[PDB]
Amino acid sequence: GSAYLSELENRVKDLENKNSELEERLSTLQNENQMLRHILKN
Amino acid sequence: GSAYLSELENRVKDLENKNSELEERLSTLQNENQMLRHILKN
Fold first, then answer.
1. Which of A9, A36, B23, B25 could connect to B36 by a Cys-Cys bridge, CB 3.0–4.6 Å?
2. Are residues B36 and A36 in contact, defined by beta-carbon separation less than 8 angstroms?
3. Do A4 and B9 touch, CB atoms closer than 8 A?
4. How many angstroms separate the CA atoms of B24 and A34, rounded?
5. What Rg, from alpha-carbon coordinates, does chain B have?
């Protein structure tokens, strides 16, 4: 509990940080996807 | 708490689901972008 809780929400601070990371990578891959599409259509 | 303690394990579950979902989208785009690069490429 005391160590469960600490490590439980310890886990979400980690899960949220990981989520932000993934979101930033996603954004980058999406921009690349769209620019490639634009280059190819022209 | 009880309310608090159910909301951290729940937040861990949702974060896990969401982060696993994000990893799939990442895989999808990496695969589409690699193909688009090959097309642009050759």
1. A36
2. yes
3. no
4. 18
5. 18
- Experimental structure resolution, Å: 2.0
Q: Which residue of B has its CA nearest to A23?
A: B22
Q: Residues A22-39, buried b or exposed e (16+ Cβ, 10 A)?
A: beebeeebeebbeebeee
CA–CA min distance B25, chain A (Å): 8
Domains of chain B and any CATH numbers: 1-42 (1.20.5.490)
Q: Running DSSP on this structure, what letter comes out for residue B10?
A: H
Distance (Å) of CA B21 to CA A9, A32, B2, B24, B40: 21, 20, 28, 5, 29
